Subunit: 386 residues, 4 copies
Amino acid sequence: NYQPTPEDRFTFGLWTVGWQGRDPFGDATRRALDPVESVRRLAELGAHGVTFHDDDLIPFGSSDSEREEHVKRFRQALDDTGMKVPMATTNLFTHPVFKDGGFTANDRDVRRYALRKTIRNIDLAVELGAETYVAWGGREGAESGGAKDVRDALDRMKEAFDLLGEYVTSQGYDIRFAIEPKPNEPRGDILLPTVGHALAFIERLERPELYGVNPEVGHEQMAGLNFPHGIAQALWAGKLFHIDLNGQNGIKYDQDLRFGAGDLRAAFWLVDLLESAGYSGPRHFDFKPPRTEDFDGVWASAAGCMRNYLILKERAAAFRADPEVQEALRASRLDELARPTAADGLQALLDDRSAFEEFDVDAAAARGMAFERLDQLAMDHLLGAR
Amino acid sequence: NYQPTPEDRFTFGLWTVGWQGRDPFGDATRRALDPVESVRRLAELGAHGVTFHDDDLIPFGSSDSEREEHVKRFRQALDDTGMKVPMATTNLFTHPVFKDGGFTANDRDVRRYALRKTIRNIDLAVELGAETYVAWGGREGAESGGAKDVRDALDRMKEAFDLLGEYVTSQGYDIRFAIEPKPNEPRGDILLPTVGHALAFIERLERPELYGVNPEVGHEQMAGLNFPHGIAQALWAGKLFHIDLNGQNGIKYDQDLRFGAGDLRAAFWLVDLLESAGYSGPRHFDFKPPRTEDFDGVWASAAGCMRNYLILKERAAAFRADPEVQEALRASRLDELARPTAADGLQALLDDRSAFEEFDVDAAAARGMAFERLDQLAMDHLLGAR
Amino acid sequence: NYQPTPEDRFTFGLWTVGWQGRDPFGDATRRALDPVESVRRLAELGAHGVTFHDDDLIPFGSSDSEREEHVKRFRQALDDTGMKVPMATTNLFTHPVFKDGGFTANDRDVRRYALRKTIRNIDLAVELGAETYVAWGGREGAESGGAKDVRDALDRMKEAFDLLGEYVTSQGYDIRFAIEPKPNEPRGDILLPTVGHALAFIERLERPELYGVNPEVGHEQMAGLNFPHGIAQALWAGKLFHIDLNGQNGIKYDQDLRFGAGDLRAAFWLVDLLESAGYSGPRHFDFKPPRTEDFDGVWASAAGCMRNYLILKERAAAFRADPEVQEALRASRLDELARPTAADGLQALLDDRSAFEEFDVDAAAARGMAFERLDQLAMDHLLGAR
Amino acid sequence: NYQPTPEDRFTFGLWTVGWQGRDPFGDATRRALDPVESVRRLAELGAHGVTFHDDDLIPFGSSDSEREEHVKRFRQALDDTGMKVPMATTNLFTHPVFKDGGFTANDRDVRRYALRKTIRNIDLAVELGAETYVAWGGREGAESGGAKDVRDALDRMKEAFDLLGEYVTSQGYDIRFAIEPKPNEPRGDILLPTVGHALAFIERLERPELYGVNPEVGHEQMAGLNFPHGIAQALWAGKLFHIDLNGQNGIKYDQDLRFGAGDLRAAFWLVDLLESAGYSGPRHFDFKPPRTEDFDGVWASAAGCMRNYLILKERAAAFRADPEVQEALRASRLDELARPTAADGLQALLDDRSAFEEFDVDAAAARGMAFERLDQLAMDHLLGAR
Ligand SMILES: OC[C@H]1O[C@H](O)[C@H](O)[C@@H](O)[C@@H]1O
Ligand SMILES: OC[C@H]1O[C@H](O)[C@H](O)[C@@H](O)[C@@H]1O
Ligand SMILES: OC[C@H]1O[C@H](O)[C@H](O)[C@@H](O)[C@@H]1O
Ligand SMILES: OC[C@H]1O[C@H](O)[C@H](O)[C@@H](O)[C@@H]1O
Ligand SMILES: [Mg+2]
Ligand SMILES: [Mg+2]
Ligand SMILES: [Mg+2]
Ligand SMILES: [Mg+2]
Ligand SMILES: [Mn+2]
Ligand SMILES: [Mn+2]
Ligand SMILES: [Mn+2]
Ligand SMILES: [Mn+2]
């Protein structure tokens, strides 16, 4: 039951199932994985593909010959399995040189280095077939108020993204960029901390059509925000280029639980929205199998990400198809929400006495919205209790 | 010491000092105030002006003759004191008809009513001299996932703001709109929950130049976000049309404490940024004197808002003017953050071996940023301990 | 399916289904309910009983004759339906006199009044059959640091609870007290903010055996705490005298959603624990039907509280009874967690070389805990996807 | 100005200034420090002493000869500087064997190992002069509901603390234990997550007088709780055996900023309370210099912890000594809060008509508490703006 196949477009970062379990208070609990092994094991579970940071696929500091062999072995694993590489990203956070940021480091030489490291990896990502290049500015931010003038930092961040767009255009590449917001951790506060801040920033770039967002479930929940609402705004803007799926229990450190863990009802409404909107990109899991697990638990955790998506997909589709739910949606006026407020135009609205002078405010106020009945139908569908 | 005068541009909502102290668990602890009295008492404290919701100035349901007398008395209080009215707003949240929203109510007749109620008050706001019209969509949102399709709701919200822009343009008014974000409360989640989401939405409106943000200290802090950072992004976008100043202790209900209470260091960095950026709009307090207070405590609380702004203004200016701080800012490379990363252009960056092939990553990583020394100078300045 | 009956011990506060929908930003959306009607409608839904604050059952300020008639009508509704009254409480938060607290008000005359108001209602609660008397100190706390010396306030709170215990002992009553913690709202911070702080305080009372806790799902979640863990500690202490069931979406204002809404997985683990531990008290819902609802939605929301408890009870029981889960629990060493660490005693442990000198730390570290497989079995059971 | 000396009792963990800067997303930015160097540098800054985990002072896995040399060098640094060692603790979190806990690990052999590792270090702590032994159960908890039966885990935690008390009693040691709560991180939820839960647990131990709490500023703030309030409850219980001072910006990952950073007003009210209550234990800083800093920034950050404590101590003492504040405290009835509610006894209260039948509730309700004036005096004192 609920068995994934590559057609479901489920993808995993090499750093997810490859996480060795080091945390701020703990040493590694698992040995490092060869990317080749991760590709094979994920393919056996029904995954569609994998994603990578530059430094996950090629150890930092590798010589050209070593780099060529790493890529060759990875390419052979992709060929052996039929796995794809839909997205890649740059590691601009692990190395100490990035301790104050990459694109917005106060040191200009570090900013130039970060751009060169990214451009090198864009070339590789294109070679491996990626359609999206993600930027997660995890080190862009501050622990103290004097350390970062944010207007200057946003100037530098715009310059960096503009140069990357000039670069991909210069090479004729079709790849597009997706900014992954996060509100905090590892910096005390991170620039572009939410989907909204990232969407707003893109609109000031030179070529905004090249940039979208890669929202992550847990990151918007770390700000206490409603992730399905933020996804709806990204879709409304035409900017949901990619998504990171995982679980998070509220406002605390970034947990990266498997998808479906954390806020289960939010996971249900997310799947409902992605399927209703026809999102066609990768269903990418950015999760960490807990460091309590051995390698068998790693693969059980990855399998559970995909299983939970498929269960929620079934339950959301049953909800929207149920005639009793369709009647409840009309009872709650979701049909009226989708109708224009004033297609008659401004002057007609101003002249419409039923909109003000003769509007019976008390009769309107007395009409219940029937949202609790609708939501209990949604709960009954989610739980299989209809 | 620290005595405000009207030139400091401090303004207060009638609903702030007028709050009677009703909370979700408590009846009123103070009698209602006549707006005329609030104008007089605020003017005596050194305020520049006042702001209003339609229903603060004219009781809901007033006849035309009553409305004319309310406005006449208010105008005479403004004339007697020299107080101004720089901003007004519509109450689209108190009346039960708005229980599911105003501009994004599922009922289309309620959406049309909300627009007509707003347009009536825009006319009054212009008559009283307001330069900004604020929209706080406190009822726009949901407690459950099925109750609001957010893409449809954003369609309705765009339609509403577009019609309001068509209206002000049709009348030749100079007033501009400012959206006030809030993440939650009274709805479980509110649409446009942060500065970023509001900035992003404005960019999809028909006439984006007419709309900016009215961020509130406590609202961004209710999402755990850094308010000075969000203000910097709004300034970077050219969209800080107005601001609401108050205090909040972290992620919990909207406290609306007096400015300077709550997160004191964030208040310091906010004042530093507003003064450095040359923000020229009203310094508006959206606060509630705690319901423990009598009327004398109300005015003490309002006075404390202005006092705390003026103390922080002095301390931030002393910080930025101190030669030892200026040296520390250079030591931490804030000068380098303000320099373009690659004014030499993309090809020059790609050909620059000092940016990659010959970049000494370890030497760069070893350079301390000296941010702790800088931040302790900032603390010493804030505390008057230099 | 999932139909409650009085044997399931579900109870509701009169203030829950009776909530008129006033919030900090909104007027009432529903008319007041007669307690008699609430008793009848709840009984028809399958409830076991109701609970009350003094001022829910008898309007504040009633004369003795009015008080007698209110009680008489309520008693007749209980007799007509077979509903019980297992718990009552005092309203020490709505009236303005309590603006700085009841038992810990700075004014001594208010503290004495609060005690007298409570004692009057203890007598009534006993007359109506209540076994538990709840204290929720919603006004005990502060918005500012100077306003409340907390050691002195805890002295006053101990004095109050000690006097109430002296009173019930003096009358020969069997009723016991349960303190309901909440971290904040309506005060900026509330004294005894969590289950732990309340348990710790009880241990300093004169007669600790008379006092336990009445934890509420949403209140511990407002501090980001794990409600099943806090319930387990209360059960471990022998102090779970009563419980308040509802839903909450994380750290924000007190939402009081219907049970099962909010954090669904936490609701599952709570029901699992209450049923496994054999909790025999009332399953009391302290919830507010959202103000979007009409009276039909009120009863739909109350019905959904009970339905969701019964669904989760079925799924948790199926989880614990499944032989595959029982094998997974052994694989994860939950059996070993329940065995004493050192029943052999201290000297035997000190002399046991297998505990230190010869303990193979690496072999132990390499053993996976298999928690992800266990948790996916739990998810499959909760979702009915086995 | 504000220069610390050893008489101020400021202490630092070796792991604080010794933190190399590894975070969940970043490699080390600083070289490891020799404990001898940290002792010397801290002594030069005016510190009183240092604290240690076993594995900070002696590398894990050291032979007896290596252990003896590590201790010998450390003892010579203490002798050379006059630094003391007032507290020590065990590392039961870094090694992978502790991935599911130490005292509450599901594996019984790990629980026995954790006890033996602790007992070995208690002996060393006593040899070095420590008066307090801290337990921070950072790995005691869970990411999922099935993985840990919390009642069984609390049984195991009680067994462990009881055995440690039996051990110290058996040796005639005077050292006492202090439990350090934390709500989450590194586990999804940690057992005994707050001061209150720890205080409540101690009351169920065999010899409760041997155990107190070691609360940390940032940890209670990670639950959104008011740290001065929790400290007041610990003092009220007689259980403040030790304290960890640092800074935290609200509900997010554990930041461990230097003391005075984070919530400055809470730091002021904490210092006010510690000084007013006459707390005589170490003023211990559990902080991490940010990984942006070099070694000079490490010592600047440590110096700033002590400076900020001394500034706040001066400002709080000036507040409490100011006759205008003393008058404001009487105006707000803080004197009445410290008076018994009913020293006349229960029967006198029941017979006192001024407490109920003749209490003028409206006159009492109308009396303002004057808390805003009091709090602005506190702000003026903190800012040096009187
Ligand atoms: O950008 C790719 C990834 O980089 C890092 O691993 C971040 O922790 C993760 O959130 C992000 O998705
Ligand atoms: O929009 C004007 C005001 O409306 C309401 O009073 C909101 O509570 C407040 O935040 C907002 O500033
Ligand atoms: O104490 C009884 C009840 O009093 C109030 O209604 C509180 O809001 C609620 O949480 C509590 O359960
Ligand atoms: O228990 C001593 C210390 O152990 C660890 O370093 C914890 O991170 C810290 O909070 C605690 O104080
Ligand atoms: Mg991610
Ligand atoms: Mg506001
Ligand atoms: Mg309750
Ligand atoms: Mg600590
Ligand atoms: Mn994440
Ligand atoms: Mn507010
Ligand atoms: Mn509640
Ligand atoms: Mn900490």
